[PDB]
Amino acid sequence: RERTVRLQYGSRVEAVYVLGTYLWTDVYSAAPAGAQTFSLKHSEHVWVEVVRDGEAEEVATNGKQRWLLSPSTTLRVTMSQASTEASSDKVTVNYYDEEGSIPIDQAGLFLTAIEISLDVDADRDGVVEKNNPKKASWTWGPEGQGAILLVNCDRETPWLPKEDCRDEKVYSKEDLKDMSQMILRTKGPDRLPAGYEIVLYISMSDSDKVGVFYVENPFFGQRYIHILGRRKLYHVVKYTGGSAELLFFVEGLCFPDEGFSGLVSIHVSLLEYMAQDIPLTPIFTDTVIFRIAPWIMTPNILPPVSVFVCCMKDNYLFLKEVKNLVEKTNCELKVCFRGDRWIQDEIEFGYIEAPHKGFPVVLDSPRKDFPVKELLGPDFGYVTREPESVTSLDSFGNLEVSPPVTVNGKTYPLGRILIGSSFPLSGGRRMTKVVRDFLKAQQVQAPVELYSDWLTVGHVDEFMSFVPIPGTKKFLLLMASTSACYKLFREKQKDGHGEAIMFKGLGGMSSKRITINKILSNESLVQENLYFQRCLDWNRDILKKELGLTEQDIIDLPALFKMDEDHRARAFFPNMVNMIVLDKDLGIPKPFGPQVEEECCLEMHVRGLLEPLGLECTFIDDISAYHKFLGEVHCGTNVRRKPFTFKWWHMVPSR
Amino acid sequence: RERTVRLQYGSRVEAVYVLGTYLWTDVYSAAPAGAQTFSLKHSEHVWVEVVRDGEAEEVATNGKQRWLLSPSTTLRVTMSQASTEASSDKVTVNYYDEEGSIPIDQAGLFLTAIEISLDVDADRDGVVEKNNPKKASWTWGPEGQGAILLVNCDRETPWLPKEDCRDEKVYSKEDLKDMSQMILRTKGPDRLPAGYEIVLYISMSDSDKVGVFYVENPFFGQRYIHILGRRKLYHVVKYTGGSAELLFFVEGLCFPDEGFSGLVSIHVSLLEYMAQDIPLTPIFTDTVIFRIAPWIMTPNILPPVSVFVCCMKDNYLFLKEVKNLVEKTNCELKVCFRGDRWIQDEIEFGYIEAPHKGFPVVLDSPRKDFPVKELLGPDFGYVTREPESVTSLDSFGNLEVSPPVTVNGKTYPLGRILIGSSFPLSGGRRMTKVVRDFLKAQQVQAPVELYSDWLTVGHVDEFMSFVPIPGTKKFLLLMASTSACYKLFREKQKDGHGEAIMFKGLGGMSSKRITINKILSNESLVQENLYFQRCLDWNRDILKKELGLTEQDIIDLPALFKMDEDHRARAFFPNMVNMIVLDKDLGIPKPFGPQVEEECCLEMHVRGLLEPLGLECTFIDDISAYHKFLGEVHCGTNVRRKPFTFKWWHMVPSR
Ligand SMILES: [Ca+2]
Ligand SMILES: [Ca+2]
Ligand SMILES: [Ca+2]
Ligand SMILES: [Ca+2]
Ligand SMILES: [Ca+2]
Ligand SMILES: [Ca+2]
Ligand SMILES: [Ca+2]
Ligand SMILES: [Ca+2]
Ligand SMILES: [Ca+2]
Ligand SMILES: [Ca+2]
């Protein structure tokens, strides 16, 4: 940048020069009236060019050369190194009139060069490079640049309830590891010249998006000063001479959302004191941008780490069988004895990542009159959105995400978020706008709405799931299918099994004596399920379109529903599609289907679909402890997974 | 898109087929239990493939071929032409058991193919093409596509006060010329099959962004039905058979703004009636997107059309001299006898453009307790923003725009909007957020804030302007300069002119007897103006940086200011920089500077700068009628210009 500095008639001008700029200097205005020509001298480390109407000529430190005084004849002044105490950096201009070669007057510019750079890791390698020329912009993609900031939503110490970003204080040194580094690098003499100061600042708007800390090491121990953030928009910096660095730590206070893109900026300015009651003049300003990292969901294809399970203390079979399942894997089991399903419905495990750090972050379902904060801890973060009135579609059983897909040649390397909804003109239920807006604003999972509102509870996880295909990079969509169930039952009936009984061993179902015959004869139930199959098929088509799937990528699992007064579906027998996926190993809800040759024909049918693909099936009984099944499951599971290997910032989301 | 349609055990299925899709058809679920194989027949215009686990084979209309019944063996069904009354389009599947070649059952699919396409001019040539494959997206640039919509902000007939978009009604046929065309094209037999209907719809959110009209031609005359818009989210379409087109007219109701990107969408769906109390199933949906055209400012380099002037009836010299100026050009003069400057301060002439049409649109300064609507008329539109409390910086004397520039290789083909502000930490005045947000949201003029708050009134047009360089494609920035003035006055003083008097002929200034000597001796005035020159120079640097300008692109015009109690500047003599620019011809405020040899030395100095470039100067006296000059101008001018030749939609704004 070129900066304007005029010589003053006829008084000396003293100026700070900031490296990486240069000055254009008017010598004409300072010339006494009548003066004809000028000459100049300058010191060793000041470079001076005479520019006569666009044409620039370098000038020696002490020459005798003279030029005609003209408004279009000016100086360009450059310095390549900061001043020291040994410095006298100056330019002096002499003026002459027509008669005689002795100067009639002189004007001069005394300069103090300093280096000022606000530096961040914009090349995203975790170390803070010196003055990245792109540090003031933020670009997506493999070739993209600009610095990344985490929302500091975890909690370092248990003694306080709230996440670390809720206040202006830092207690634990460990907190700083969650934070991005920003360094103010300076070089100069012992002191700034009289009337200058260096100031860091942010906008009022960004003041609830960030906080910035300085670490001091005084006598009695380390301390962390919050210098920018809520109710602090600027901070006057103490200047140290020589080559100096001030290290700052930056935290994000909130995720991208409706009305907040995720971009924030921090400035440093050299300000010049003019006089009392006059604002200070920014002489030089340097800017860095951060993008706050989005919250990202993990699909079922990612490696499992921890299986979280909730259930009543005495459901023994569930616990034994889940423990057995997880023992086949390298996962940890965590058990808790909020709704009965709350672990599945009230929380979603995502993560956040920056080049320096990442941790899992729990999303909490909208209020359940009380928030679930109990999982908040070190490197396990929390976030929530508070509405609009909440419906069953706001539960996170209604929130899932696909494996990475490519659609019409557009790649979605993090998969796509899926949420159940109702038809546009239906006047049906829909997830609250506040949560939908949140998921959309994260941008990197490009959410798709499915149709879940034909279900009483209304959750996409009632009808669909994804599983990896072992020994490959591929995956399958699993879809509930009533037609598969009817086909299977009609076969078994034809085979002479019509009297085969379901719900065997559930004592509270026994008096119903439900058989294949009894099911197939129920005419209204047949019509209800043909209609439910239309709802499933409408979803199938959306998924195929928005995920770029073919029929080869889909397996249909038999399912059956009963209709309520709102013409919405609830499971007739447990929905097998909502299953625990740990790589090749699948916990599948035990269906309690008709027994043929002392095996459940639904279990055998599901094994016949999945086992040839190398998937290993374990059926998990969560209903026996209740003696019957009315369409509700009383247990829940949630799997916490490793983040994607692909870095979110390498994605290029649509405008 | 592939769509799922199942044969039904064992009942016939009737379905609408929409051209541009195809069906995947399950024949397995409809097979009776025990059946082994199936065969099929189909009609002439239905194309049928047997797809066995991914492998597709075309099948004849009546063959005898049989395939093994499998869940993974399905049909793919395609049609290339809409059904007519002569059509019987069908596929029939026969099932066989192990014993015997006579069918044991059959299932069939009866089809009615129709074409449904919602079409817009997405290739931006003004005509509505058939089903543009890109019509559902909107992309910037020369290769970009998607349809454009004007805010219909003008007023067709004087009998109503409000702009045409304020209501849901259309009166004049001429209104439709402002509107974008959207055509629903259909092809099919005499009627849709039982249980279907076609519905146009928009989101609740877009309902205040658009309105859509259908033109009817009943008996007693043409009429315009508003079918989508405020409080109408959907409209059931009347289906006509054969090849049919329904023509719709679309208007935008508002400009892009904070929280509204400018993009809106309109849908059509074929809905299937399921049963009472059940929502209808969207079978097929087609979508078009519009972008509402932004409001665009015109810089001084664009051809002038009309010069608007306001002044008191008896300021005769001003009127005569302005009339004389405009007579040198091809422009029209319009005179009006709100503030004294209101024409300059309360209105800004912009425009809007779509491929089919464009018109000028006036922006009205925020409330002046009353809006200025008097310019609202046919193809002259109005828009305003209502705050925050208003200050002098909200006036449009504080709103200007540069000529097209390139900066760091980034092109700004429409120039950049410039608005005066205060330093960030100053606590000074700033244009209201509501107007700033508005200008920013237009995106194509990428606004820059300058520093105007050192001026009492606080307007960028007090210190700067742009002029074209005649006979070239180039332009100059003109900057007020106090240093230029002091240099000139000190010269004239040295020349023996120190007693030369300013304000000659202004009787109310006479007793002051202000001379060059009196000015140059005033020490505090010298310091005030050195400080004002620092403010001007700070702006110079911003303009050079953000407009990509060098010192070769800038001319300094002498100016002088007095300081008030807030340390803000007001003109000492009229600011010559704020001038009427009509191509080569410039109306320049008459300065009333010191007379040397019976000519104003400020006028002569300005001629010496500008005339060599082919600029013709006319000095315009607006102050003589007031007998004195206190720093306020009582007249205003605004020039309405031809829009840029460059089409805004060819620009590629930053993300
Ligand atoms: Ca780095
Ligand atoms: Ca904290
Ligand atoms: Ca932390
Ligand atoms: Ca941490
Ligand atoms: Ca979930
Ligand atoms: Ca077209
Ligand atoms: Ca209207
Ligand atoms: Ca109109
Ligand atoms: Ca019109
Ligand atoms: Ca203006």
UniProtKB/Swiss-Prot annotation, chains A, B:
Changing residue 164 to A: Reduced enzyme activity. Its EC number is 3.5.3.15. Changing residue 367 to A: Strongly reduced enzyme activity. One of its GO terms (cellular component) is azurophil granule lumen. Ca(2+) 1 binds at residues 121, 123, 125, 127, 129. Changing residue 348 to A: Loss of enzyme activity. Detected in keratinocytes in epidermis (at protein level). The active site is at residue 635. It comes from the Eukaryota. The keyword Metal-binding applies. It holds the Pfam family PAD. Ca(2+) 5 binds at residues 348, 396, 399-400. The keyword Cytoplasm applies. One of its GO terms (biological process) is chromatin remodeling. Binding of Ca(2+) triggers a conformation change that is essential for catalytic activity. InterPro entries: Cupredoxin, PAD, PAD_C, PAD_central_sf, PAD_N, PAD_N_sf, Prot_Arg_deaminase_cen_dom. Keywords: Calcium, Cytoplasm, Hydrolase, Metal-binding. It is found in: Cytoplasm. Ca(2+) 4 binds at residues 164, 167, 169. Homodimer. This is Protein-arginine deiminase type-2. The gene is PADI2.
